[PDB]
Backbone:
DNA sequence: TCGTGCTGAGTGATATCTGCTTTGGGTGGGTGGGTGGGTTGAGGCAAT
DNA sequence: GCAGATATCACTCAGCACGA
């Protein structure tokens, strides 16, 4: 019981931290932000939460990028070597 | 220092947030009466009190996440005259900013007042504003 | 049919890039004792990510840093300039 | 797509239309004033009276400088002359005289930013 | 102590391919058209 | 002629071992 309570308290903290990134309104509410960089150019970032916090806006701009660099992980199972 | 700006316009979001926070922090209903040419109807108890502070405190005591707003109240104040037009013309961004500012105001009220209220309930609650009386029908 | 865009030494050495960083990097970035360490790290990463996006929108921040590491390891002309900046300071 | 030799020239008709909007006089030219009102955001509908076109054509012919029959061209194919008239109005549009708001103009901030970005990119 | 040519591996863009109807029903229409088809029977309620 | 789901081929990149 004590361990379950501790784990539930940890999960509650994680949920609270996640809630900070979610919008109060629904997905299709709308709202576009235009963040201008110092060299007189503005990039458009969507989402309600990006309007108030700049870090979230930059993070979402980062995630929107599609291209991913390669990562090759050649691993051999133990059964291969018996 | 990148500057956040609403798309297609020239309104700084930080200006909106600070103006709305100031309006909520210090607003007395006497301004609303003054605006409507009802100066002689001003009392000394209800009109000399921080309206939205009592609204937010009642919200907290009753455990609610809703604050009904009147646009004519925004027009009454001095710093939020342009905020009325911004709300009318760009409702989505202004509404989101107002919701976040309301949540921040509640958190700041709890922290500064040194109350024993646990921060968990307020932190995980979504707060929404519901403006009405926004002009002619 | 079309060669892939790639972070070559030519792009890095252009007016935008390393010259841009040397021009304005200390003015924008500022680590303050009063502010928490997280905020200072966020500011530094904020500057560098903006610069990378302006220069190389193709790759994300971590991928950009890894590509920069590889290029610095490989390209000799980049090494020439990198040594040169240090040499000027020794002169100063 | 085999081609035919139709007896209609669009360059000459466009020139005639451009002259019509700057010379007709039913006060200065009627349509110049109408456009001036539009540029002040006071009017949002320009109505071209084919009677005016006929009057202008007959006035030109009386002087001896006969031109193409614009009225018959407009009725025979009207979907094309809308574009011609719009292009002529855009070309001959006057600058506003009454101070405009320019405050809540989404397609003015968008265009200003688009011009700034294009100029900065091309210049570099 | 280390630099570079060869290799397997995996995406990116592009080649062929199937499909382009589909469907029973009146808040999908009849300028979408019948060679795409739709063929009740009891029970309740207003009028009288 | 047109959009979508699918499979094919070709090109380029990070690791590896050896020789300098």
Residues:
């Amino acid at each position: 019981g004590f361990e379950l309570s501790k784990l539930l308290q940890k999960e509650h903290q994680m949920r609270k931290n996640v809630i900070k990134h979610t919008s109060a309104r629904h997905s299709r509410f709308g709202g576009l932000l235009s963040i201008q960089t110092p060299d007189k150019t503005r990039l458009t970032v969507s989402g309600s939460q990006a309007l108030v916090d700049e870090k979230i806006a930059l993070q979402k701009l980062d995630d929107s990028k599609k291209w991913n660099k390669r990562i090759i992980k050649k691993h051999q199972s133990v059964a291969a070597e018996g | 220092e990148p500057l956040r700006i609403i798309w297609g316009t020239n309104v700084s979001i930080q200006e909106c947030t600070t103006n709305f926070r100031n309006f909520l922090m210090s607003f007395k209903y006497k301004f609303r009466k003054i605006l409507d040419e009802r100066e002689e109807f001003i009392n000394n108890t209800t009109d000399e009190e921080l309206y939205y502070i009592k609204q937010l405190n009642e919200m907290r005591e009753l455990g609610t996440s809703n604050l009904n707003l009147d646009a004519r109240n925004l027009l009454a104040y001095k710093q939020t005259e342009d905020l009325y037009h911004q709300l009318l013309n760009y409702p989505q961004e202004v509404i989101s900013i107002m919701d976040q500012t309301i949540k921040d105001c509640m958190v700041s009220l709890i922290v500064d007042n040194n109350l024993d209220y646990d921060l968990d309930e307020i932190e995980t609650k979504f707060y929404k504003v519901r403006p009405y009386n926004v002009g002619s029908c | 049919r079309r060669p892939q865009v790639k972070l070559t030494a030519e792009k890095l050495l252009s007016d935008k890039g390393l010259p841009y960083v040397l021009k304005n990097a200390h003015k924008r970035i500022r680590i303050s004792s009063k502010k928490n360490s997280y905020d200072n790290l966020s500011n530094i990463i904020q500057f560098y990510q903006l610069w990378a996006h302006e220069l190389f929108p193709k790759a994300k921040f971590k991928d950009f840093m890894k590509i920069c590491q590889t290029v610095g390891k490989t390209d000799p002309v980049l090494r020439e300039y990198r040594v040169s900046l240090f040499r000027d300071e020794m002169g100063m | 797509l085999p081609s035919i030799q139709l007896p209609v020239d669009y360059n000459n008709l466009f020139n005639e239309i451009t002259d019509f909007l700057v010379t007709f006089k039913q006060k200065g030219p009627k349509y110049m004033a109408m456009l001036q009102k539009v540029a002040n955001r006071e009017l949002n509908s320009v109505i071209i009276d084919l009677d005016d076109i006929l009057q202008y054509q007959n006035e030109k012919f009386l002087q001896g400088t006969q031109a193409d029959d614009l009225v018959s061209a407009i009725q025979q194919n009207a979907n094309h002359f809308t574009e011609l008239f719009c292009r002529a109005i855009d070309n001959n549009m006057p600058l506003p005289t009454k101070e405009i708001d320019y405050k809540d103009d989404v397609l003015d901030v968008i265009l200003n930013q688009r011009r700034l970005r294009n100029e900065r990119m091309l210049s570099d």
Remarks:
- Chain C has five helices and no strands.
